[PDB]
């Protein structure tokens, strides 16, 4: 009963004992819903041509050989010829974007050629983060433009709603909102610099995505409901496996920590387990999860238990001396620097080659 207790682990046991336990098939189709959410956000970024031109940007800078393709793409050697084919697909979608159903079906063709565009999972995390940077950057530019485009009005929204169904870019809806003889018109007709700044920002959006705000706004809505369904399925998966964290956290109870701190470290380990969980390997959930639970708990218990640029490579690579030296000892005996010598030797390696 809510009320008569003060033991925090008793309240936590009472809280976790309400969500039911999954069966063998329940985690399977919950992971299927997780797969549906991640391919949902993958197909909303597949149609997005800005991800395509940024991956082409990363392609023609890695064609200058600054990085390796081992930590860039997991597959679909074959990488060079396949990326040449994808560059050909990029340039045919580039020069045939000017014409409109052919442009539509070539957006479909670049989104389905994105279906083999699978990369290594650390770089895939970095790619969904960089897509968050640029894509959510133009998302929050649209968000600041809609908040800034509603806050200056201070009128009833209804005529602005019927005006908002159009383009909301140029000055003809501005003149339509001016020529409708209301007292807010003659005091708000000085909004021309606001809609003109929205005009130049929207021409940046026009060279960015090709067309209007409505398609990218519903694409943002698709990304939002995809990530929301993924978050809700992740919550439904972690809320039916806390008993696993209790069953593992009992074995390390008197090893430097209290009880609930072990449970919370295991909860973070379970979140990292379900974030990296795949279902097609046949193993159900527990033998994959218990590795991350035990590892996070024992790690928390372990926790509670140019002449200069030439000479740094001289004392760095084991050359011109007896034994090798890592990035720590010659850093601390050279200067007080630790990662600066890594930047210095990276500049030396990208300079002399």
């Amino acid at each position: 009963e809510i009320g008569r207790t003060t033991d925090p682990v008793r309240m936590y046991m009472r809280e976790m004992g309400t969500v039911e336990l999954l069966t063998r098939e329940g985690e399977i189709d919950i992971a299927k819903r997780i797969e549906d959410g991640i391919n949902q956000v993958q197909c909303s970024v597949a149609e997005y041509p800005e991800a395509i031109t940024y991956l082409l940007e990363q392609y023609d800078r890695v064609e200058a050989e600054e990085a390796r393709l081992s930590d860039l793409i997991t597959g679909f050697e074959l990488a060079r010829e396949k990326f040449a084919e994808l560059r050909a697909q990029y340039v045919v979608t580039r020069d045939t974007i000017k014409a409109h159903a052919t442009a539509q079906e070539e957006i479909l063709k670049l989104s389905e050629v994105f279906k083999q565009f699978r990369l290594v999972p650390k770089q895939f995390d970095y790619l969904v983060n960089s897509m968050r940077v640029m894509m959510d950057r133009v998302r929050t530019q649209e968000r600041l433009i809609m908040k800034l485009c509603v806050e200056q009005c201070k009128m009833p929204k209804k005529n602005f709603i019927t005006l908002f169904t159009g383009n909301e870019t140029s000055d003809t809806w501005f003149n339509a909102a001016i020529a409708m003889n209301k007292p807010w018109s003659e005091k708000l007709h000085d909004v021309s610099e606001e809609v003109h700044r929205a005009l130049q920002k929207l021409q940046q959006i026009e060279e960015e995505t090709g067309l209007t705000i409505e398609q990218v706004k519903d694409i943002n809505r698709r990304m939002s409901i995809g990530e929301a369904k993924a978050r809700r399925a992740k919550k439904e998966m972690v809320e039916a496996n806390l008993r696993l964290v209790i069953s593992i956290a009992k074995k390390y109870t008197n090893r430097g920590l209290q009880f609930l701190d072990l449970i919370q470290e295991g909860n973070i380990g379970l979140m990292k387990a379900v974030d990296k969980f795949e279902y097609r390997r046949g193993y159900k959930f527990s033998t994959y999860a218990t590795w991350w639970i035990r590892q996070a708990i024992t790690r928390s218990i372990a926790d509670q238990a140019t002449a200069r640029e030439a000479k740094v490579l001289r004392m760095r690579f084991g050359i011109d001396m007896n034994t090798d030296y890592t990035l720590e000892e010659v850093g601390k005996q050279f200067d007080v620097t630790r990662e600066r010598i890594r930047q210095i030797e990276a500049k030396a390696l990208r300079k002399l080659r």
């Binding site: 925090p8 701190d261 973070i268 007080v336």
Partner: protein
Amino acid sequence: EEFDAIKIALASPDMIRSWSFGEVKKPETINYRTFKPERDGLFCARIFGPVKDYECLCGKYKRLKHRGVICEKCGVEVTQTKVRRERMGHIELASPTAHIWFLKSLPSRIGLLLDMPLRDIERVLYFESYVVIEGGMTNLERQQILTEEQYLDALEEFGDEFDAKMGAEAIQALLKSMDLEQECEQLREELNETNSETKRKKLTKRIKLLEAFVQSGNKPEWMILTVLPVLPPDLRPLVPLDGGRFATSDLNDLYRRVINRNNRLKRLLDLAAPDIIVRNEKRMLQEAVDALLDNGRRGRAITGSNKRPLKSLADMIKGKQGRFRQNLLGKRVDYSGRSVITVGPYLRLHQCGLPKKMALELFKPFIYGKLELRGLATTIKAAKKMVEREEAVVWDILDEVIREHPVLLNRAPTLHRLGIQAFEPVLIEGKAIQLHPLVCAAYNADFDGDQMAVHVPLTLEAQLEARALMMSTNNILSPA
């Protein structure tokens, strides 16, 4: 150092940031291989000052010629290590937590403010139930507690209009949103129509609390901590034992637990965690802060290794072994010693027999002064060897010094004021004090093993106070 008042009030988060010298960010105290503090730890030298007297940590700047200098290899300013008991830190809490004193020290100071039950307040802080803050509809009234079922049906019903929160952030929002002047006017006009005596006394309690708040100038939301100050490290030291193992500092353990749970709450809030895990982590941080402030008050006492409850800051303040009652109203004292008393039946009424070794130890800076004034000792090492070898000239100097210098003689328990009396000492061979047989009724001192303490007064004011007030030939009659 002139002042004429001592003023107490509540502490702003910007006030705690103004006392602060840097945020403690990691729960490590010191490295244990090399006894050096960690960066941004609980013992950090860049925040709390250097360890050695007039050095830095890396030992580059060793001399006093760099009297205040921020070093470059480590960043710890070379100065006195006296600053390690004056410089406080702070901890930016990842969520607001309630202060245990203004929640449990009865009357509860929040249930007296908002007029809420303490059970409902604790049920909100314990993440067991919601409470509405502002209702745009007429269906919901302020300070109404909702269960989670009621919260879900009202959330799907009204959609977005009301806003109910849960935990200490909800109570901080309530205290931020309340209006003390309008509440005081409403209660003052309520007190006219109040005929019930219990409602009258409860209303006078609440009215005086509101009037105290508006006349002191404290905001009422400062009873909910958002920044947590950190005691300086020389006031919670690490004491090594003899076997290379440090001793358990309970304040360091509780501070370390707060930093660990706060870092984990920051990682959960950044990782977009599920709400059950986030609420459990916030509840653990709230109880860890409450344990640090006053351990054995809200729930069970958090114990240490030896199954004793840990000391907290309220334990360091309160009690017979507390700071007040053990170090401010009475303390240990230099120029003092003790021995067994015997009878001197050959003394006058103003004389005590004081042993030679005792008076020689108690009177050593006076002997150094007369050794300089007579010229028998020119260097301090020579004076040290002269007093240590106990030369006959040193005994002559001691007989000159002891002469007309009263000492205070005290026997516990000092039940009344005639258990401290000033006598003029006679230097006798032996190890026992020789009390005069007539003052034994005042001291209640028979000779079956009673011991007494000698206390040397130093200044001329203290010597004349002992001569004119506390001399045993002034205390002839009782005061009782």
